Amino acid sequence: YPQPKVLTPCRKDVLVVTPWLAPIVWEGTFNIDILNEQFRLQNTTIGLTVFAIKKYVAFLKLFLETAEKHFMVGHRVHYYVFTDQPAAVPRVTLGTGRQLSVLEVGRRMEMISGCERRFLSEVDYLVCVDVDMEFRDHVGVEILTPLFGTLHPSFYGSSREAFTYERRPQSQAYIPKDEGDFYYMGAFFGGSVQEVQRLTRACHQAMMVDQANGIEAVWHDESHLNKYLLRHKPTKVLSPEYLWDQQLLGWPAVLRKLRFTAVP
Amino acid sequence: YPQPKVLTPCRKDVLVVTPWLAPIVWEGTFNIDILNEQFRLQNTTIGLTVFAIKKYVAFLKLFLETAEKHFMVGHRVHYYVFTDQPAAVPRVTLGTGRQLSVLEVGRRMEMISGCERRFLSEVDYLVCVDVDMEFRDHVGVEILTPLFGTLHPSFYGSSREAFTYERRPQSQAYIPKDEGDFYYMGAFFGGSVQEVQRLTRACHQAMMVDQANGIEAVWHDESHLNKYLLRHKPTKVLSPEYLWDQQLLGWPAVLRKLRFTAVP
Ligand SMILES: O=c1ccn([C@@H]2O[C@H](COP(=O)(O)OP(=O)(O)O)[C@@H](O)[C@H]2O)c(=O)[nH]1
Ligand SMILES: O=c1ccn([C@@H]2O[C@H](COP(=O)(O)OP(=O)(O)O)[C@@H](O)[C@H]2O)c(=O)[nH]1
Ligand SMILES: OC[C@H]1O[C@@H](O)[C@H](O)[C@@H](O)[C@H]1O
Ligand SMILES: OC[C@H]1O[C@@H](O)[C@H](O)[C@@H](O)[C@H]1O
């Protein structure tokens, strides 16, 4: 492979590492051949969780189809579809080493954290996403790490005072005006099973405290996710390549790939 | 602290992440306040090993004195001085939470890997350096990670064909002309105790194989270190700030700090 050269940065237009030395994942920063070998040597299994409740079942066909094309191809994958309509889950043909479980429900942080023992035995990493999305390009093992969040596409160019963190100190999700690294979106986070269970258990515990005190954070679990990732910093951060809306935001030059996007 | 901004890289003159998403540690890439808190929360202890055999005992006073000023200040530190002259080890006054053990000898990869049980109980990380050096500036927890190597100061601008890897395929340290990420120097490596014991055990095993086959790698343990870090890629790479010789190489603009340098 091309020899990296220490005096020629690959990307000079974007921050590629956080101040706590976590990689920020952009096209041009990783050699996927290297990463694939590292992960295949450990026989890595990746769990992907998606909620499809009521009308949202309609998004599953395109979500699954495009995950088969782009999501961890070559690696073991276990999709977990949480739904109130098990009969509505479309039968999508899967590649080898890939499987799908339907988990009938009848919220997300709770549901992710009481499926606890099942995830620990079955997968090495968990990735938690929204269902009303599609994969358009590679999303692979470059994202994998103990704990990751994703830069919210509307706020990656913003100053922190503008971040819509929870601002009331009455809420467990409270973050002062002068604190904050990034604004992560709730739609794409993950990590090792142990770290995701820690995060979702914390967020759930914090939501219950707010509920008992008669307050809902301004953006619900995303507020708590942001407070958690402030205090427990992620070991990788995904760039907005990993969570985009072309309809609302276009295709800026800074995004060399649009990998996982909102459905119009 | 200053808010990192995703569209303003801190350093645009240097590669700050490897193609396998390991940070390359340069001044300007890390907020040490963040890192210090993370490590102090775990009550981190760092072991620093140094060999001072024969004449090399003379380098210990300045090495230890300047380590006290610059090396992991604020954190727990355990110096391990391997020497053939225990009475020649200078008595240097140490800061709180810091200790020094004198290990009488009567090579390095062997010696590091049979002190195995002692390191596992006493320290969380191990750092292995040459003694004929001095600390001139901060060397702290930014370096800490499961496995790290350091860019050899003479070769960081070079192409791989120029790297003085072992080129004879008869040697365990053999690396083909078209393979190779970097040229790491043997003078500064480390990691978790488990990873350093794995590395030094591998290098030792490989040296014995070469010795049994009547061959010495061209640069001895540095050759084996380079073969190991090719096949087991380091989780952080230190920039040449961490291993420099101002007499031979000056003080280039690209080096904002000279942290650990050869003694003239
Ligand atoms: O009725 C619903 C609402 C939400 N969701 C899941 O939670 C996410 C949030 O959807 P969004 O917040 O865009 O809709 P809203 O929060 O406004 O109901 C969806 O992607 C689904 O993955 C769902 O399955 N059914
Ligand atoms: O007689 C010796 C040679 C080496 N060393 C240790 O191993 C390192 C290598 O020294 P160097 O290779 O510069 O000297 P040489 O390898 O030419 O003997 C030294 O820093 C010491 O840390 C030592 O203690 N005594
Ligand atoms: O301010 C945060 C909000 O940003 C909106 O753009 C987004 O659609 C919401 O889901 C929420 O993340
Ligand atoms: O080619 C590798 C060699 O480079 C020299 O500059 C160095 O002093 C030697 O110790 C060895 O590392």
Collapse the DSSP code of B71 into the 3-class scheme (helix H, G, I; strand E, B; otherwise coil) and give the result.
strand
- Strands A188-192 and A147-150, by their bridges, are antiparallel
- Which ligand sits nearest to residue B108's alpha carbon? 2
Ligand 3 site residues (CB inside 6 A) read A 152, 154, 164, 185, 219, 222
Q: Is residue B110 flagged as an active site residue?
A: no
Residue B187 Cβ inside 6 Å of ligand 4? The answer reads: no
CA A19 → CA A63, A171, B151, distances in Å? 34, 27, 21
Phi, psi dihedrals of residue A120, rounded to the nearest 5°: -55, -35
| Residues of chain A neighbouring B239 (CB-CB closer than 8 A) | 6
Residue nearest to atom 11 of ligand 3 (CA): A219
* Parallel/antiparallel/unpaired status of strands A98-104 and A125-129: unpaired
Residue B107 and residue B236: Cα distance in Å, rounded? Answer: 26
The method recorded for this entry reads X-ray
Q: Dihedrals φ, ψ of B137, to 5°?
A: -160, 175
The beta-carbon neighbor of B20 closest among A17, A35, A236 is: A35
- A37-45 long-range Cβ contacts below 8 angstroms, 24+ apart: A38/A141, A38/B20, A38/B233, A39/A75, A39/A141, A39/A144, A40/A74, A40/A75, A42/A124, A43/A76, A44/A75, A44/A76, A44/A124, A44/A125, A44/A141, A44/A144, A45/A75, A45/A76, A45/A77, A45/A78, A45/A122, A45/A123, A45/A124, A45/A125
Distance CA A33, CA B181 (A): 14
Nearest-CB residue to A8 (from B1, B3, B15): B15
Q: How many whole angstroms separate alpha carbon B121 and alpha carbon A188?
A: 39
Which chain A residues are within 8 Å of B10, Cβ to Cβ?
15
Place of tokens 């692979």: A140
Instruction: Categorise residue A21: left if φ over 0, alpha if ψ from -120 to 50, beta otherwise.
Output: left
Which domains does chain B possess?
Answer: 1-264 (3.90.550.10)
Relative to the alpha carbon of A263, which ligand is closest?
A: 1
Query: What gap in Å lies between CA B111 and CA B33, rounded to an integer?
Result: 35
Nearest CB partner across the interface for B17, out of A12, A16, A180: A16
Q: Which chain A residues touch B29 with a CB distance below 8 Å?
A: 17, 19, 21
Report DSSP state, residue B7.
Answer: T
Tokens of A233: 């910093």
Query: How remote is the CA of residue B164 from the centroid of ligand 4, in Å?
Result: 8
Cβ partners under 8 Å of residue A100, min gap 6: A64, A78, A79, A80, A81, A89, A92, A94
**Cβ pair A165, A223 in contact under 8 A:** yes
Residues from chain A that touch B151, judged by Cβ atoms under 8 A, are 6
What is the spatial distance between Cα A150 and Cα B2, in angstroms, rounded to a whole number? Answer: 20
Task: For CA atoms A82, A83, A87, A88, give the dihedral sign.
Answer: negative
Which residues contact residue A46 at a Cβ distance below 8 angstroms, ignoring those fewer than 6 apart?
A72, A75, A76, A77, A78, A123, A124, A125, A126, A127, A141, A144
Kindly state if the Cβ of B53 falls inside 6 Å of ligand 2: yes
A84 is in an annotated binding site: no
Residue A116 known to bind ligand: no
Residue type, B116: E
**Contact (CB<8Å) A30/B19:** yes
Question: B232's torsion region: left (phi>0), alpha (psi -120 to 50) or beta?
Answer: beta
Q: Do A6 and B14 touch (CB under 8 A)?
A: yes
Indicate yes or no: CB of B9 within 8 angstroms of CB of A13. Answer: yes
**Dist. CA B206–CA B216, nearest whole Å:** 11
Residues 6+ apart with CB under 8 A from B263: B59, B62, B132, B133, B134
- Nearest ligand 3 atom to alpha carbon A164: 1
Closest ligand 4 atom to Cα of B163: 1
> Which of B156, B166, B185, B225 gets mutated to test ligand 4 (max ligand atoms within 8 A of its CB)?
B185
The distance of B51 to chain A (nearest Cα, Å) reads: 30
> Is A221 among the annotated ligand-binding positions?
no
Of B6, B31, B151, nearest to A6 by CB-CB distance is: B151
SS (H, E, C) A37-91: HHHHHCCCEEEEEEEECHHHHHHHHHHHHHHHHHECCCCEEEEEEEECCHHHCCC
The nearest CA of chain A is from the CA of B139 a distance in Å of 15
Residue with the smallest CA separation from ligand 3 atom 6 is A154
- Can you give the resolution of this entry in Å? 1.9
Protein residue with least CA distance to atom 23, ligand 1: A53
- Please indicate whether, in this complex, the C-beta atoms of A38 and B233 are within 8 angstroms of each other: yes
Query: What single string gives the DSSP state of each residue in B153-182?
Result: TTTTTS-GGGS--B--TTSTTB--TT--S-
